[PDB]
Amino acid sequence: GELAQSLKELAKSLKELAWSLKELAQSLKG
Amino acid sequence: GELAQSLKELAKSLKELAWSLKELAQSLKG
Amino acid sequence: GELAQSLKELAKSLKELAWSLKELAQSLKG
Amino acid sequence: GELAQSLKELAKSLKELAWSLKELAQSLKG
Amino acid sequence: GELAQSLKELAKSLKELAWSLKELAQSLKG
Amino acid sequence: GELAQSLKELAKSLKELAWSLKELAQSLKG
């Protein structure tokens, strides 16, 4: 269940990453 | 239990990331 | 039950990520 | 031995990712 | 060890992602 | 055994990603 809390954490980070790259994409179209 | 749930969470984040990287790629061809 | 399902879902998200990376790699080539 | 070490290393990489996301979020604000 | 092959896979993908974002960064400075 | 090794691999990739996201953030302030 420690392995699990770390993978929960990674999944939260990757979600924020995906959000950021979406905002980056939006500003690069213009 | 915990782990399966973590892994579902991780999978979801990863499809979100993949989508945003297609959007990033599209904004750069754009 | 829950677990092996989690792993089939992770495995699909990983391929989606791998195809999006391939598209981002290509859009970064001129 | 090997395993718990693996997990302390993952846990540090997750914070580094979280601080880099915070810097990327801020550079994406004007 | 199936969980392990999936995490090996994710680590390979995230490595390529980090590569791409480096090339994206290089082209955005100019 | 396998899992600890996967997790070491994952951690390494994640520090590489964090670095590249600092470089991306820097190129956008740039």
Residue numbers in the entry:
A (entry chain A), B (entry chain B), C (entry chain C), D (entry chain C), E (entry chain A), F (entry chain B): 1 to 30
Reproduce, without paraphrasing, sentences from the article in which this PDB structure was first reported.
The two collapsed structures were more complicated. Nonetheless, both had extensive KIH interfaces linking all helices and, as such, are CC-based structures. And LL sequences form collapsed structures. However, the cognate structure for each sequence did not always have the lowest score, as apparent from the off-diagonal white and blue points.
CCs are quaternary structures comprising two or more α-helices supercoiled around each other with cyclic (Cn) or dihedral (Dn) symmetry. Peptides are named systematically appending the one-letter code for the amino acids at the a and d sites to “CC-Type2-“; e.g., CC-Hept becomes CC-Type2-LI.
